[PDB]
């Protein structure tokens, strides 16, 4: 169909235009809450680690999709491999609090510690970008912090995720006509 292209009103033609038939679609895998709900690894600091989803690398599935939203909300689960006991403090806590074990402290139990944590920021939602300094995000954009004698692995998992105002999501720029890769296949 033709239309006024200057308008942002979406136009979605279908194959029925030339005699085809539109099929049924099942889009559960592109549901935001479902797709963000899985663990992703970040490289940890030795002891004190601020819980900040922007640490998730931008090329990962979770990191790229998170960056494709401007504002977001979620609760969180973390899985941590650590020596010693692990202490968590909420958003707004003095860093010294990390040495006091009345703050949620999980005693070491092999092979790792998994915890469910609530959102604790003072804002109604957080943002992946913030036009203040025109990089740096306000200090209040975090889910608290953790500390152990040694933290060797740290995974984040967004729960009940909500996203607002989509932003660019980019695939790899290929050099040839098509980006080609080795796909899994039965052997020789």
């Amino acid at each position: 169909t033709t239309s006024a292209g200057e308008s942002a009103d979406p136009v979605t033609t279908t194959v029925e235009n030339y005699g085809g038939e539109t099929q049924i679609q099942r889009r559960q895998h592109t549901d935001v809450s479902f797709i963000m709900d899985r663990f992703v690894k970040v490289t940890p600091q030795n002891q004190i680690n601020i819980l900040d989803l922007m640490q998730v690398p931008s090329h990962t599935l979770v990191g790229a999709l998170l960056r494709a939203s401007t504002y977001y909300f979620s609760d969180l689960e973390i899985a941590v491999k650590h020596e010693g006991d692990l202490t968590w403090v909420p958003n707004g806590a003095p860093e010294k609090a990390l040495d006091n074990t009345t703050n949620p402290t999980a005693y070491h139990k092999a092979p790792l510690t998994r915890l469910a944590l609530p959102y604790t920021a003072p804002h109604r939602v957080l943002a992946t970008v913030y036009n203040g300094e025109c990089r740096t995000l306000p200090t209040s954009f975090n889910y608290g912090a953790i500390k152990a004698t040694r933290v060797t692995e740290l995974l984040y998992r967004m729960k009940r995720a909500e996203t607002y105002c989509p932003r660019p999501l980019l695939a790899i720029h290929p050099t040839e006509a098509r980006h080609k890769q080795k796909i899994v296949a039965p052997v020789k």
């Binding site: 539109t22 599935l61 790899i172 040839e176 980006h179």
Partner: protein, 220 residues
């Protein structure tokens, strides 16, 4: 006595996509209200349908320009979400995180020449199994649409999903020399004083477009 249980081997290890939740440690937290915030999206494909994004042509521009040759091919590219032409689209950005897709992909063409420039174009879908057509006459035998310029500057066309299997791969294998899903062929039938004018092209998901099987495949 107490309840006897069999602690089973092969179960219980942490799985990164497991369907259960962790034990909580800090309760009774009430959040600041966020109801009615603007711009929410709950399914990435709603965004993909509603917001078409630009294709990329030779030279790194989102348009093809009128030719004044005997060569009437404006663009010909692999119908692949891994194609260079689709590489800056939101659709390709989303598709890299799933292994399979099915359904309709819509292309939009917007003419930007002045009022005194006129043209007639043709889009055709060439299926795999034969080399793609080099002329509008050979391409006429394919599924295709022709349109001209006028008051409405945009034309939209649905590329149909046709394949032996019910799903196709979003990625392209190093062994597949010719594109397994065929080609999109855009021709200029003719033009009247439209030399140098640009036809801008965008793509969006169709009504039955579907992505399935999440996958995290990038190394960087």
């Amino acid at each position: 006595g107490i309840f006897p249980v069999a602690c089973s081997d092969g179960y219980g290890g942490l799985v990164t996509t497991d369907p259960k939740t962790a034990d909580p440690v800090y309760g009774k937290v009430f959040n600041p209200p966020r109801n009615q915030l603007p711009g929410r999206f709950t399914n990435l494909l709603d965004v993909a349908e509603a917001c078409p994004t630009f294709l990329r042509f030779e030279g790194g521009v989102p348009y093809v320009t009128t030719k004044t040759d005997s060569d009437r091919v404006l663009a010909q590219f692999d119908m692949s979400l891994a194609a260079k032409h689709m590489s800056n689209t939101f659709l390709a950005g989303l598709a890299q995180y799933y292994t399979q897709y099915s359904g309709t992909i819509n292309l939009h063409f917007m003419f930007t020449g002045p009022t005194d420039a006129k043209a007639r174009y043709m889009v055709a879908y060439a299926p795999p199994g034969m080399e793609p057509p080099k002329t509008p006459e050979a391409a006429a035998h394919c599924i295709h649409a022709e349109w001209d310029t006028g008051l409405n500057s945009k034309f939209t066309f649905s590329i149909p999903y046709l394949s032996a299997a019910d799903y196709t791969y979003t990625a392209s294998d190093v062994a597949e020399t010719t594109n397994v899903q065929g080609w999109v062929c855009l021709f200029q039938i003719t033009h009247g004083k439209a030399d140098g004018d640009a036809l801008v092209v965008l793509a969006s998901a169709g009504k039955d477009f579907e992505l399935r099987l999440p996958v995290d495949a990038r190394a960087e």
